[PDB]
Design a protein around this ligand. Structure first.
Ligand SMILES: [Ca+2]
Ligand SMILES: [Ca+2]
Ligand SMILES: [Ca+2]
Ligand SMILES: [Ca+2]
Ligand SMILES: [Ca+2]
Ligand SMILES: [Ca+2]
Lengths: 636, 680
């Protein structure tokens, strides 16, 4: 019932009078809608908040600024247990309005948001010094961003930076291991003997399809094998072990950082059907696993992958929102945890189903060219690429991390920017006005940034047994990522209602599960996917006299016998299996070597799982989750 | 001190005037110490406590000091720490006042201290009639009553032992079920019935185990053991091992549910004030000493390992004289000897560990408890499970073949059906001996000390009737917890051997809860109440045991239990390209697997020709038989088998770990009724 229009002040941090402060904005643009809106406004007035409705220069849309006086905000802060910064004021006013999401969900109320500082006073400082591209190198003023945006976004950015630093450590170690593998390429006997036309040229390997792809010569595989040997060497072993250790150190030191930030910022604040739903979600998960597996220069492929992942992500968001309400406990925290879990599961499938397929599905469920697996009209489950499943996984992971990360950040800046541009399309205006035209932060928007980084963490840790440059790629990605997120939140997206975050959130159990699954997955990649264990077993057994023709053990002769002599009966070929060349009473069957092979690597897998989990337990035991200095300031 | 003696009323917890009750007892019996003691007496006078000092009739030097607190003092100290004041509350308040006594008692000026009993064996009389008694062995425990009498930690220990007993009930029932399945299928054990078949079992010519004076013992001598061996490694045992993983999972979650229930019920969660330093720690006001202390532990760890190696040497030395089946008696005697040596070394390490932890400096008593827990649990783990891990995972594993056999010297071999029979014998011996002898000792030792104290030397008062009993000590139920954790390790870590492991163990627990209870009311004194919401460091330990158990169990089934070789035969070698049977069956297993050995031994001796006149003997290994281009050597079979076992380990580990994760995640650590009561 109050209206006053004034756009004369461009940098109006206050109302028309200037005494009050902007603590929120609600936009108002049938008769029963008007009655309900008036009832809510009267309730708001009775709570004590001071409201002011104004008409924009460009009419029909009316902005309703609000300002909770000092007494009411002080009382509500006491409920949670100029003096207060605008972040806390916005959070308090939003909590008051909550007892507003239901209103804005329907068409009765359009939108509401806290007001920013100014254009590009604190946003100017944290834009030029922190958010502007001119200041990429310098670290973020964590206290300043905590002051402005909030504790939840602050914890997100602090976690992002810490994860970047730990990525830098793992990345320098990965670069060391990568160069150790790369320099030792001329001494790689297998690569050279494959490259030899006398050996490599004569030997032949089996076709992937049924008379579609013909027989090919090892020359292409000889050329591709050098990169495989670069990514298939004991440097990969040492880096996988180091990554098993580094995940533990990462998690533990982040526990320490969480504790220290909890002390510094007082983040700790307080205020049958299930079985059927689980069965349905498992069915959907396997369905989309099948979808992605069936789905499966560099810039175009990366863009295509990004678009596919985007549309699939939209589908997952739709289906998860549809299915969550059936088991909704009418609890926002429980609902958001369930949505986090379901969206993460859909994304986990969408991203890592192809990777798991490359690792442990190509060449595994394919029988010998005599009677392979035939399921339906679709036939002959495709064999692994002759270059190497490790090579394919490294290619796919590099594509995903690098290209999809740069494209995701380009989208993260442009899409809000272009939406803001087309909104402004629809002269001087107050700096509190344009924040309406630019898009509001979506529901659980920061959940998406957290999910993106959790997906990157999964790519880096889960599949690090392939190539050690994944931490480096994710390091540069994080360096860009933190600043693009800062820029979009500073400029494109209006101010988000500050939250309180004791930790990052539901992604912590996700990260722990990813750590355990990453240990087991790295072990099974090294053994099952990479042929290093059969390489070593051939070396050590079939190179010493009892099984080999060499006086001292040497890997020579491995190539002449890794090809299982073949006669085509549904000249010689070999698929992904150590089989029995003719001369045995049974041929095309699990060979003497093959049991050596599986026993060796899965015994290596047992050893590695046990030692890595032992080291993780020892680290969690030895390394406290609370720092010494944190205890010293706690006892103060 | 108002020192005056009057035995008078034989059973009266009140003063000479009788107006006020009594909570505690301090016994004592020079000038500087006499000056110092009366100073603290004046300190308690300023603290308001009331103490009655009596010059006991039996010894004129002995003086008892009965301790009580006035109601105002009780109220203000109840304010300090978070018939109205129950005797347990009075005891806790009194000792908190005394602590705010450790140094004076340690210094020897005050001889001892304890909390009073009601009467002879009236809370104590009721607690001895319907509880703490062999006749009442089949009645539920008055847990709230023993909480009001003894204290919080005592209550939680007895609750934990009862809950362990309950869970072992179902564990033992399922174990008996699988054991019955194996016993029933014993009639159709093709390999064992083949062993006891003179046509095939009588033609088994197994190679000698030792070089000197050991014949080629045929399978006939072990036929009867084979009868009870097919039961030990049968698919029912495997199913029970999986169920044991499940029950291990179910155990601790419901325990912590019950523990939170008791936290709400007894209001265990109270003011955890800063702990007082131990008197010995403050007497002398460290990293090198700690590292030196750790070195002492690991040196003795090798010592018991060396004692275990002596058992290995003993079996090697004593089999020949037994031979002149002998190996069964040898194993039984060796297991008895190992149990005796474990019991002997247990007390030795108890004393030396108390001394060692005295040597190092814990800043608080709970730090002492944690360090002692770690050292004691480590040593007792090594003690009890060293022989068991040896039999399960070392004995017979690395013997090679008759040509160039392994030397150290000449490590032990094992029977065709594995050493799960010997491990079963060792486990049964250890656990049954633990029950019978350990519990008899648990009763007698405090009773024996009571008897010898009485012989030192009729109307006697409560304080005289109770001081002439062994004080419990500041540790207390540490050792019964350790005993039950050792039993848990035996039951779960080793359950792949015999499913009846809980059953007899169940027996123990029942008997256990009474014998201990007996000594806590009859033989020993009453122990001072302590506050302890949880059983403490033992709970993480069990978790580790749980995490260990799965692995161990899988390994025992894969490595120790020979079931995997038989499944490998039954699904891969009955085929005509590998055997002769048209379909899948287990017959021919023994004739097929254990390859022969023609007598061509390496000269690195050759006692085979000296000790017999046989041509080809059959060893229990899959290596190459004669006619092979590289004979007496590994073949396809052994690596097939080892891949089967390791893959079984991986499958069982991952499946069982997944199931444990699912159960812990699905079943919350807080009960719905518990949360409802908390909300109300
Ligand atoms: Ca990105
Ligand atoms: Ca982002
Ligand atoms: Ca820690
Ligand atoms: Ca006992
Ligand atoms: Ca006992
Ligand atoms: Ca649980």
């Amino acid at each position: 019932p109050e209206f006053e229009e004034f756009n004369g002040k461009p940098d109006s941090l206050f109302f028309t009078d200037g005494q009050r402060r902007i603590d929120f904005i609600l936009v108002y643009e049938n008769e029963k809608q008007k009655r309900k809106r008036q009832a809510y406004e009267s309730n708001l007035i009775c709570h004590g908040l001071q409201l002011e409705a104004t008409r924009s220069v460009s009419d029909k849309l009316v902005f309703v600024k609000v300002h909770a006086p000092w007494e009411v905000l002080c009382t509500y802060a006491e409920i949670m247990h100029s003096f207060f910064n605008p972040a806390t004021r916005s959070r308090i006013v939003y909590f008051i309005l909550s007892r507003i999401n239901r209103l804005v969900s329907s068409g009765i109320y359009k939108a509401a948001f806290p007001l920013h500082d100014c254009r590009f006073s604190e946003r100017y400082l944290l834009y030029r010094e922190w958010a502007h591209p001119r200041s990429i190198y310098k670290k973020q003023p964590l206290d300043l961003i905590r002051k402005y945006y909030g504790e939840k976004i602050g914890i997100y950015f602090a976690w992002l930076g810490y994860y970047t630093q730990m990525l830098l450590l793992a990345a320098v170690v990965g670069v060391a291991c990568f160069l150790y593998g790369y320099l030792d390429q001329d001494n790689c006997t297998w690569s050279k003997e494959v490259c030899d036309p006398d050996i490599g040229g004569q030997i032949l390997m089996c076709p992937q399809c049924d008379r579609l792809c013909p027989f090919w010569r090892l020359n292409i595989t000889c050329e591709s094998s050098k990169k495989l040997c670069i990514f298939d060497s004991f440097g990969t072993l040492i880096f996988a072990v180091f990554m098993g250790v580094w995940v533990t150190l990462f998690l533990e030191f982040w526990k320490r950082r969480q504790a220290e930030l909890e002390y510094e910022w007082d983040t700790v604040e307080l205020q049958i059907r299930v079985t059927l739903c689980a069965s349905a979600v498992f069915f959907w998960i396997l369905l989309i696993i099948a979808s992605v597996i069936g789905i499966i220069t560099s810039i175009t492929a990366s863009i295509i992958s990004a678009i596919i992942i985007m549309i699939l992500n939209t589908i997952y968001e739709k289906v998860a929102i549809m299915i969550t309400n059936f088991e909704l406990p009418r609890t926002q925290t429980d609902y958001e945890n369930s949505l986090t879990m379901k969206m993460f599961l859909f994304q986990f499938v969408n991203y890592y189903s192809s990777c798991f397929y490359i690792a442990f599905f190509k060449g595994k469920f394919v029988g010998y060219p005599g009677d392979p697996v035939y399921l339906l009209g679709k036939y002959r489950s495709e064999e692994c690429d002759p270059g190497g499943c490790l090579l394919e996984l490294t290619t796919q992971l590099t594509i995903i991390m690098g290209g999809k990360a740069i494209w995701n950040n380009i989208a993260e800046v442009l899409l809000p920017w272009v939406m803001n541009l087309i909104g402004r399309y629809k002269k001087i205006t107050p700096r509190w006005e344009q924040d309406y035209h630019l898009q509001p932060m979506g529901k659980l928007g920061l959940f998406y940034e957290y999910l993106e980084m959790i997906i990157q963490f999964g790519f880096v840790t889960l599949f690090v047994a392939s190539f050690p440059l994944a931490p480096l790629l994710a390091l540069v990605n994080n360096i860009l990522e933190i600043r693009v997120d800062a820029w979009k939140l500073t400029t494109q997206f209006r101010r988000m209602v500050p939250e309180k975050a004791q930790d990052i959130g539901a992604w912590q159990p996700i990260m722990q599960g990813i750590a355990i699954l990453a240990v087991v997955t790295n072990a099974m990649i090294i053994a099952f996917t990479s042929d290093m264990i059969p390489r070593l077993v051939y070396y050590w057994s079939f190179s010493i006299p009892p099984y080999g023709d060499h006086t001292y053990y040497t890997m020579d002769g491995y190539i002449n016998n890794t090809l299982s002599v073949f006669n085509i009966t549904d000249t010689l070929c070999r698929y992904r299996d150590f089989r029995n060349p003719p001369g045995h009473p049974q041929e095309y069957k699990h060979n003497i070597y093959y049991w050596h092979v599986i026993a060796a690597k899965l015994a290596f897998i047992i050893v590695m799982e046990h030692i890595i989990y032992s080291v993780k337990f020892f680290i969690s035991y030895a390394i406290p989750d609370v720092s010494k200095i944190t205890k010293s300031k706690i006892k103060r």
